Design a protein. Structure first.
Ligand SMILES: O=C(O)Cc1noc2ccccc12
Ligand SMILES: O=C(O)Cc1noc2ccccc12
Ligand SMILES: O=C(O)Cc1noc2ccccc12
Ligand SMILES: O=C(O)Cc1noc2ccccc12
Lengths: 150, 150
């Protein structure tokens, strides 16, 4: 069911890790800076996400997180179906790659306004989600609202 | 404009601080554990919130955050109108008090499943936002904002 599908994405900058969740149908994202991508960090990020949006299915970003007992525990707790993130359609991976580049670009554009990387990442989340193309933020709300009325 | 109005709420547990943002019209919340309520922590929390939902107006939780230059900078950056949180209608404060009690109760009910308080708080956020009262707070916020976009 399209409304509930999210994709995990892990990218790197300034020797740190940026963990991203993308709502596939809308392009809407949430993101956090973590010291490194562990099962525990990924599990906590998914718990936060699922408390905030109706997360039905997650395409995990790699096999370590797919295997992780802590990630599996979080998915069980929050009612998330954990799936692999293998792009059976290969245009999927190019879209994520492009987004990581887009996000890094925005981070560079705001980097001066923020002392800490985590502030710059949240500025980038804001700009990404508000960007008129409707915005991603508008699309996710419309998609989920339409789904609730069924 | 009702769709964009949020209220900040700071409550305490286990010698730590839980910062909550409530979407007034729906009862939907986001929350985080912080070591203490500083301007900088509050500013960052508001930036995160406004990147994720269309935050137009925030009723700040106290005068220190209302005054804070860092909070004012975040509100300017994110396009948020900062207002005081004085309950000109006094039933407002009782609703927040009740929610803090409700959240603490849920935290107690899950506390055993979580090693860290921050995990228990996000479990409580999840349970609060999914609770059917019939629609949930998560369903209501999406419906309110979708109606407003159109
Ligand atoms: O128990 C913890 O604090 C580890 C943890 N971090 O995130 C979680 C999500 C679900 C279940 C457990 C966790
Ligand atoms: O994109 C907008 O300007 C309005 C908006 N509508 O819904 C949103 C959700 C998240 C973020 C922003 C929004
Ligand atoms: O990293 C900083 O510059 C401080 C900061 N923390 O959170 C913010 C939000 C908006 C603007 C600035 C900040
Ligand atoms: O509350 C629900 O069961 C589904 C739901 N619909 O929209 C939401 C937004 C946030 C969290 C949960 C939801």
């Amino acid at each position: 069911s399209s409304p509930g599908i999210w994709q995990l994405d892990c990218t790197h900058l300034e020797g740190k890790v940026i963990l991203v969740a993308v709502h596939v149908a809308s392009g809407y994202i949430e993101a956090e800076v973590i010291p490194a991508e562990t099962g525990q960090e990924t599990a906590y990020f998914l718990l936060k996400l699922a408390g905030r949006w109706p997360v039905k299915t997650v395409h995990t970003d790699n096999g370590s997180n797919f295997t992780s007992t802590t990630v599996k525990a979080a998915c069980w707790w929050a009612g998330i179906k954990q799936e692999d993130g293998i792009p059976y359609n290969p245009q999927s991976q190019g879209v994520i790659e492009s987004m990581n580049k887009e996000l890094k670009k925005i981070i560079g554009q705001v980097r001066d306004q923020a002392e800490h990387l985590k502030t710059a990442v949240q500025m980038a989340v804001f700009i990404h989600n508000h960007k008129r193309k409707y915005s991603a933020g508008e699309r996710i709300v419309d998609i989920i609202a339409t789904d609730i009325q069924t």
